[PDB]
Design a protein around this ligand. Structure first.
Ligand SMILES: *[C@@H]1O[C@H](CO)[C@@H](O[C@@H]2O[C@H](CO)[C@@H](O[C@@H]3O[C@H](CO[C@H]4O[C@H](CO[C@H]5O[C@H](CO)[C@@H](O)[C@H](O)[C@@H]5O)[C@@H](O)[C@H](O[C@H]5O[C@H](CO)[C@@H](O)[C@H](O)[C@@H]5O)[C@@H]4O)[C@@H](O)[C@H](O[C@H]4O[C@H](CO)[C@@H](O)[C@H](O)[C@@H]4O)[C@@H]3O)[C@H](O)[C@H]2NC(C)=O)[C@H](O)[C@H]1NC(C)=O
Ligand SMILES: *[C@@H]1O[C@H](CO)[C@@H](O[C@@H]2O[C@H](CO)[C@@H](O[C@@H]3O[C@H](CO)[C@@H](O)[C@H](O)[C@@H]3O)[C@H](O)[C@H]2NC(C)=O)[C@H](O)[C@H]1NC(C)=O
Ligand SMILES: *[C@@H]1O[C@H](CO)[C@@H](O[C@@H]2O[C@H](CO)[C@@H](O)[C@H](O)[C@H]2NC(C)=O)[C@H](O)[C@H]1NC(C)=O
Ligand SMILES: *[C@@H]1O[C@H](CO)[C@@H](O)[C@H](O)[C@H]1NC(C)=O
Ligand SMILES: [Cu+2]
Ligand SMILES: [Cu+2]
Ligand SMILES: [Cu+2]
Length: 499
């Protein structure tokens, strides 16, 4: 791992994760990028050095540290034109923030256009030396991170606006496409008798994946950086940008077992060892598994997840029993997505810079119609009713700056105001099920925070709004470093072909 104080150098390079060589955006030479790690209480100083040269995958960049509250450091959150202007090619920018009150599995990715899909994404772990789940496992290290990623042979800006699936699913950076039946598979090593904390992180730009390991059950202990009660499952449907920790007990026969991550669309299944990796017990021959998948009898259901510790739901236990309730009405016209009638177009002046320049009301903030000003220290309920008007369901929405209670999950009609899981990315389900996924959070984090579908192609199409939380306190609470102040002039001075 690298960090908490580290350089992350961003370049364009040729990669071949599935045997097909293409130019990609890489971090310290690799995609997925290296594991960034630290411990709860740490200050991270992550110096992002932009050495990009290819305008088609963008020469500018900006990085979101997915899942972190960024309290007092809203300027470091990452979304381009929300929290900063992009970093310009030939420049570096220091993200300097603390993680005082969180531990778990996170990730980092470009938050400029669809650039993360072209490779700028990697895992990020914040360890807890007093982890309350520590007694459940023996091993938790670099080699227990499992990343899932969709990989495309055609670059984000060069393919269809809304691709119909990836060429390959990558597990720990490797996987197979139809074009190369023998490409190297990732191998995850375990020692018989040891218990492993696997940190499963979806770096996906679009598809969700149904994850399972032949011959093994999994005990979920963490959901999007929130410790859970232990939940035994035999498969996990993980949506773009979500994380789970699960414990695997390596107590089966020494052998090779298939690890499966089946996407919801694209090249589905396992012909030729696509959508697969290898769980290899020490002493097993260096060959492919020949294990068979068994029907999932205990799939994960989000309504079965509960916080490990008592975690009260904001507000009162009825619909709209909060200080402010917002409904998000979705539309789509073939190229663009809309929320409450507005398709998000990034403003010239980043939203945070607008606020620091005086703009504190929805009326004064740009883009008009996409900013929701929230009161401070208030309970908020947001509902995302699934609608056929917004194809590409299930849309996994992410709220920056916050964890939220999932009061109503996809595929459920229960409102749980008692002990629902808290997380940061939620499937909003499907219209076929009449879903109306509903979340609650408190506004104790002054700043503009993005709220959007984490299918990066949909975000690009405008499927986003901004929650402008406690605007009159944003400047005092989020002092900005000179380097941040310099971003917009530098970026704005760029030739368009150097963006
Ligand atoms: C800036 O970034 C953008 C975005 O990433 C990038 O865009 C690329 O732009 C080019 C030019 O438009 C696109 O080029 C197409 O690439 C197609 C795919 O090429 C892959 O496969 C080639 C064929 O492989 C077979 O053969 C070899 C044996 O020769 C074998 O090993 C293979 O297994 C397989 O059997 C392969 O040659 C090629 O590898 C070259 O390129 C990669 C980088 O792409 C490089 O890393 C390698 O070292 C090597 O130089 C690659 O693996 C290709 O099929 C396609 O060609 C057909 O179409 C053209 C035009 O329509 C026809 O005229 C031609 O005859 C072919 O029929 C064309 O070349 C490419 O797709 C874009 N990339 C992406 C990801 O979208 C820019 O290039 C970047 N800028 C810079 C300066 O790098
Ligand atoms: C993973 O979890 C599943 C679900 O809890 C476990 O499945 C259960 O496994 C036992 C066998 O270990 C099954 O019972 C056995 O069934 C056979 C055949 O009918 C019978 O001959 C035995 O006497 C015994 O009763 C049980 O049906 C099955 N339960 C299910 C599928 O709901 C599984 O064992 C766990 N895997 C591991 C590796 O721990
Ligand atoms: C999804 O849930 C929301 C939140 O409860 C529903 O919106 C409320 O609808 C009632 C009428 O039933 C209005 O009186 C409220 O003002 C709405 N709340 C808002 C806008 O915050 C919504 O109708 C539900 N949608 C579906 C499709 O079930
Ligand atoms: C969809 O709406 C957008 C944004 O308002 C508009 O620019 C675009 O032309 C429309 N697309 C289609 C396919 O009609
Ligand atoms: Cu993210
Ligand atoms: Cu979406
Ligand atoms: Cu975001």
């Amino acid at each position: 791992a690298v960090g908490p104080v580290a350089d992350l150098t961003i370049t364009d390079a040729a990669v071949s994760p599935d045997g097909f060589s293409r130019q990609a955006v890489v971090v310290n030479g690799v995609t997925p990028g290296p594991l960034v790690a630290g411990n709860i209480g740490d200050r991270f100083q992550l110096n992002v050095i932009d050495n990009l040269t290819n305008h088609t995958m963008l020469k500018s960049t900006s990085i979101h540290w997915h899942g972190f509250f960024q309290h007092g450091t809203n300027w470091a959150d990452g979304p381009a034109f929300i929290n900063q202007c992009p970093i310009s090619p030939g420049h570096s920018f220091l993200y300097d923030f603390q993680v005082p009150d969180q531990a778990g599995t996170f990730w980092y990715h470009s938050h400029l256009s669809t650039q993360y899909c072209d490779g700028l994404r990697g895992p990020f772990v914040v360890y807890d030396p007093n982890d309350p789940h520590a007694s459940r496992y023996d091993v938790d290290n670099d080699d227990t991170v499992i990343t899932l990623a969709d990989w495309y042979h055609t670059a984000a800006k060069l393919g269809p606006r809304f691709p119909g699936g990836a060429d390959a699913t990558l597990i720990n950076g490797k996987g197979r496409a139809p074009s190369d039946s023998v490409a190297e598979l990732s191998v995850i090593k375990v020692t018989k008798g040891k218990r492993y904390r696997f940190r499963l992180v979806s770096l996906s730009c679009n598809p969700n994946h149904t994850f399972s390991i032949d011959g093994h059950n999994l005990t979920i202990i963490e959901v999007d950086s929130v410790n859970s009660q232990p939940l035994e499952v035999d498969s996990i449907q993980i949506f773009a940008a979500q994380r789970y920790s699960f414990v695997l007990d390596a107590n089966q026969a020494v052998d090779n077992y298939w690890i499966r991550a089946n996407p919801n669309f694209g090249n589905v299944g396992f012909d030729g060892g696509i959508n697969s990796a290898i769980l290899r017990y020490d002493g097993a021959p260096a060959v492919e598994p020949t294990t068979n998948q068994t029907t999932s009898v205990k799939p994960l259901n989000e309504v079965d997840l509960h916080p490990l510790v008592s975690t009260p739901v904001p507000g009162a236990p009825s619909s709209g029993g909060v200080d402010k309730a917002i409904n998000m009405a979705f539309n789509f016209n073939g190229s663009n997505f809309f929320i409450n009638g507005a398709s998000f177009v990034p403003p010239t002046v980043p939203v945070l810079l607008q606020i620091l320049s005086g703009a504190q009301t929805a009326q004064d903030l740009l883009p008009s119609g996409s900013v929701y000003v929230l009161p401070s220290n208030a309970s908020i309920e947001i509902s995302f009713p699934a609608t056929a008007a917004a194809p590409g369901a299930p849309h996994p929405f992410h709220l920056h700056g916050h964890t939220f209670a999932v009061v109503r999950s996809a595929g459920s009609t229960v409102y749980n105001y008692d002990n629902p899981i808290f997380r940061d990315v939620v499937s909003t389900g499907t219209p076929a099920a009449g879903d109306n996924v509903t979340i609650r959070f408190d506004t104790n984090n002054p700043g503009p925070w993005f709220l959007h579908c984490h299918i990066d192609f949909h975000l690009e199409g405008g499927f986003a709004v901004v929650m402008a939380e406690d605007t009159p306190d944003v400047k005092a609470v989020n002092p900005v470093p000179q380097a941040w102040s310099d971003l917009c002039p530098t970026y704005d001075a760029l030739d368009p072909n150097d963006q």
